[PDB]
Amino acid sequence: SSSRNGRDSAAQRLGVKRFGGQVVKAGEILVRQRGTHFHPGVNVGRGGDDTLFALAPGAVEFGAKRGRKTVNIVPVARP
Amino acid sequence: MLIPRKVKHRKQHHPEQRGIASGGTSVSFGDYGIQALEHAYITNRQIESARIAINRHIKRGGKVWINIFPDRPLTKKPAETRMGSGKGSPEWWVANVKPGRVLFELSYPDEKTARDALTRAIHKLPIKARIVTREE
Amino acid sequence: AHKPVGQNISEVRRNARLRRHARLRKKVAGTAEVPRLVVNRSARHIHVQLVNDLNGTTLAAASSIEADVRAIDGDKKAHSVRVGQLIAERAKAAGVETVVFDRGGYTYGGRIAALADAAREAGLKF
Amino acid sequence: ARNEIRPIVKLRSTAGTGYTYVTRKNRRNDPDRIVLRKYDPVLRRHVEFREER
Amino acid sequence: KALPRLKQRYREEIREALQQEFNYANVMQIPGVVKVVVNMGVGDAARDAKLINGAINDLALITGQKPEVRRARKSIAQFKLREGMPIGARVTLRGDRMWEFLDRLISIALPRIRDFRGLSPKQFDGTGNYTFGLNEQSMFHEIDVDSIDRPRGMDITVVTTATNDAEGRALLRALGFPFKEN
Amino acid sequence: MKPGIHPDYHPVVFQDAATGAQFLTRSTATSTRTIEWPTPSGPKTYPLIVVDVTSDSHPFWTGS
RNA sequence: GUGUAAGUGCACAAGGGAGCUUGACUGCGAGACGGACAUGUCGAGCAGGGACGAAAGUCGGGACUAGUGAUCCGGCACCUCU
RNA sequence: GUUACGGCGGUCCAUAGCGGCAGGGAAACGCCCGGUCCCAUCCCGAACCCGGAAGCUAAGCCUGCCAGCGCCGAUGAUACUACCCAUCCGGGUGGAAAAGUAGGACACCGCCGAACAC
């Protein structure tokens, strides 16, 4: 007379965190993710948990490189 | 009786009764069809009753197509039990039927007997329905 | 009405080369102050370039087709060596000291390696 | 967890003239215990340890 | 500075005859044998892991090259078969060694089979690759036929750049395989 | 092939003991598997192997 | 197919295979995520001393997420602290 | 500058693919000859590597052709929907698919090198 279900796992707060256009510093986290849904491009690095981060400051551009959505960083214009 | 041989998930939500048909709004394989007008869940036993109603009204020869199959279950739970403590087991199987959808298609020569048969099969179902010719 | 069946080894060797070259290329980069040294080999002769992959442009060039390089007599290896000399001179004229070395989808050793080692000897930083 | 004689067993990895116990948990149904091993100690440098429990 | 029998013969007569038969534009279209293949499925890997070594030794003595030991990539337990159990040996042959092997096979052993009426013309496939099989190794004088402890048969298959069975059979005829001439 | 040596490789003279239509050629058959009588059939001398039976002494498609 | 559940990914291989091998290191850490709080997660880059590689460069465990339990009280080795 | 050339790259990567037809080999791309030397096969100079240019453009590759296997793809309408009106029903302002259709398309672009030339 039991429901043997009921369990669940607390969240991990995944997804995009710095969308198109924004200004990001270095080492900042663009997206947390399990697999490489989004891949790195230029001035972008990968983590251990397939997190992404910035290697050079600038601003974002979610473009594709041969069918795969990438993330990039572009040079800000110095004031 | 109509049931599937196996479903992956044997406890499903209740189907939706919102919206009009997308397919089965056109007679396909016979000449004289049935078309729904309302929203409803139609079960196994209803369709059995209806096909028997038709075959006992033509009685010799003339074909009957059933464009529906009860591939979505529903869950009763045993009697006099307080609410809670889980989800009941599947007991009868429905097909959702949105308005515009076609259920049955006959192929018998004379329209008299055919229209009459379809009417006898309409009065075995919970829905308002109407009768269709393949024409425009 | 004679007709073949399937893959020739020329096709195999070609597409495998492209396969592993664009495997390797993941790690190699390009820039006008650190360009890529591509090599493109054949049985007879050889070709090389200095590439900027930021714009897919080219800064230097050389090959064992030019009569001045055919003026070598020695082995294929010696042709390759003099080629490395020429590209060192040309690169350091056009203003490049440091580079990487892309083996272009070929194995290191033999003509490729003797080229590159001659270049390392004659000044290029790799 | 506990201290049962688990398949993944043993510990301690001590150093020769290098007293910086580096630790690792490994099995023990396999044979070996007189070769390999290396790491950086104090004041010293990349040299060779034992697995000495 | 050397030439095997079948290869000298190949470059002398057989290319000419196939040209005069099939009338190719380029001679590059001429059919030519590439390699020869040998295999032995032990099959009792789960019952004798030592017949494998026996077969290795036999094929060594037979072909003059240490075989390859083919592992079982899948595990099908209705045969005891598990991932990595050695089931068979395999050898590739290319060049002068190949031509010498065909010379020996055609000239010593296949004229030593018991009541050899003929190898079929129907062991081909798609274009002309001849895949036959031997029950015993009691035939090669290469083998020390005193020491054998069991029959350990084998399976041979001969691959060629021929494009169809007609060209394959014609080439292998010119090279001297005893087909059943039919 | 390469070290992890294979069997040894030397020539051979397969002397036709049927009708004297002998063969002779390079082979991987030697110390491994050879017979005495280094009979030169050619400009050089190399082992010989009695051929108990062969093609021209084995009635078949190629022989009656 | 991916050691083990599922998903997200992996053929550009993270799948399969072979050679060396211990970075399954030490001293740190910009800036960030998530955030009641304590916990938790990644982290480029610098230094010694190394592996591999021809070099560029990668290596601060495992394709990623689970695989464990705060504080107190005791125990073992080392310290130029008392 | 230029031709039926080769090589390195790019496109928010099939408008670029697969298959069929014809056609080309000057220098180059190739295939091929052979394992003397570096080097290599979980066995095999098959591959990788080395030394050369007898032979052939048959194949790879490049060129044109075929919209056929695949892809791309609108306008307008519909579904759905935000907001508002509305005693159930339904409706108005804006947004707007998928599929389908008309069609498109046997790719385009950049750099160096050759050959060719004033």
Neighbours of E138 (CB within 10 A): 16
The answer to whether residue B78 sits within a structural domain is yes
The secondary structure of residue C71, as a DSSP letter, is T
Query: Which residues from C are below 8 Å from E29, CB to CB?
Result: 2
Residues with Cβ within 8 Å of C34's Cβ and at least 6 positions away in sequence, in order, are C98, C99, C100
Domain tally for chain E?
1
Closest to F15 measured CA to CA, from F53, F63, F60, F58? F53
Contact E18, E170 (CB under 8 A): yes
Question: Using CB atoms within 10 A of its CB, is residue B13 exposed (0-12), middle (13-18) or buried (19+)?
Answer: exposed
Residues with Cβ within 8 Å of E61's Cβ and at least 6 positions away in sequence, in order, are E142, E143, E144, F7, F32, F33
Pairing of strands F12-16, F49-51: parallel
Alpha helices in B16-110 (DSSP H): 44-58
Rounded Cα distance between A49 and B122, Å, is 60
Listed in order, strand segments (DSSP E) in C10-119 are 36-41, 46-52, 57-63
Domain tally for chain B?
1
CB nearest E142 (choices: F33, F53, F57): F33
The token pair that represents B48 in the structure block: 């059995």
Residue numbers of the domain that contains E21:
1-182
Distance, CA of A49 to chain centre: 11
Pairing of strands F12-16, F23-25: antiparallel
Question: Using CB atoms within 10 A of its CB, is residue A2 exposed (0-12), middle (13-18) or buried (19+)?
Answer: exposed
Resolution (A): 3.4
Rounded Cα distance between E141 and E148, Å, is 13
Quick one: which H or E segment has residue E98?
helix E96-104
Residue of B nearest to A3 (CA): B86
Closest to E42 measured CA to CA, from E70, E76, E5? E70
Residue numbers of the domain that contains D33:
1-53
The answer to whether residue B4 sits within a structural domain is no
Domain tally for chain D?
1
Closest to F21 measured CA to CA, from F32, F3, E72, F63? F63
Q: How many angstroms separate the CA of D1 from the C1' of G27?
A: 31
What does the radius of gyration of chain E's CA atoms come to, in whole angstroms? 18
The residue whose two tokens read 């032990």 is E42
Q: What strands lie across the sheet with B32-36, from one edge to the other?
A: B63-66, B102-107, B32-36, B129-133
- Measured CA distances, B75 to B14, B88, C112 (Å): 9, 5, 73
Residue numbers of the domain that contains B94:
23-136
Contact B69, B79 (CB under 8 A): no
Contact E156, E33 (CB under 8 A): no
Domain tally for chain F?
1
Rounded Cα distance between E54 and E140, Å, is 15
Q: Which residues pair with C58 in a beta bridge?
A: C51
End-to-end CA distance of chain C: 55
Contact C15, C8 (CB under 8 A): no
Q: Which residues pair with E157 in a beta bridge?
A: E37, E131
Rounded Cα distance between C46 and C113, Å, is 13
- Which CATH number fits the domain that encloses residue D37? 2.20.28.120
Rounded Cα distance between C44 and C65, Å, is 9
In degrees to the nearest 10, what's the CA dihedral of D39, D44, D47, D53? -60
Query: Which residues from E are below 8 Å from C4, CB to CB?
Result: 163
Nucleotide H47's nearest residue (CA vs C1') is C13
Closest to E123 measured CA to CA, from E134, E137, E138? E134
- Which CATH number fits the domain that encloses residue B65? 3.90.1170.10
- Positions of chain H reached by protein Cβ under 7 A: 6-14, 27-32, 35, 38-53, 55-61, 79-80, 110-114
Return residues 3-62 of F near E (CB < 8 Å): 4-9, 14, 23, 25-29, 32-33, 49, 51-55, 57-58, 60-62
The residue whose two tokens read 């150093």 is D15
Taking domain C27-126, whether its CATH number is 2.60.40.3670 is answered by: no
Rounded Cα distance between E64 and F34, Å, is 13
Rounded Cα distance between F60 and F64, Å, is 6
Closest to E98 measured CA to CA, from E18, E38, E155, E138? E38
Q: Which residues pair with A40 in a beta bridge?
A: A71
B4 torsion bin: left (phi>0), alpha (psi -120 to 50), beta (else): beta
The residue whose two tokens read 């990968």 is A46
Rounded Cα distance between D51 and D45, Å, is 18
Query: Which residues from C are below 8 Å from E24, CB to CB?
Result: 2
- Chain E and chain F share a number of CB contacts under 8 A equal to 69
The secondary structure of residue E179, as a DSSP letter, is B
Quick one: which H or E segment has residue A39?
strand A39-40
Q: What kind of experiment solved this structure?
A: cryo-EM
**Long-range contacts of C2-6, Cβ-Cβ distance < 8 Å, separation of 24 or more:** C2/E22, C2/E24, C2/E29, C2/E163, C3/E163, C4/E163, C5/E126, C5/E127, C5/E163
Contact E130, E170 (CB under 8 A): no
**What residue spans define the domains of chain C?**
27-126
Contact A56, A24 (CB under 8 A): no
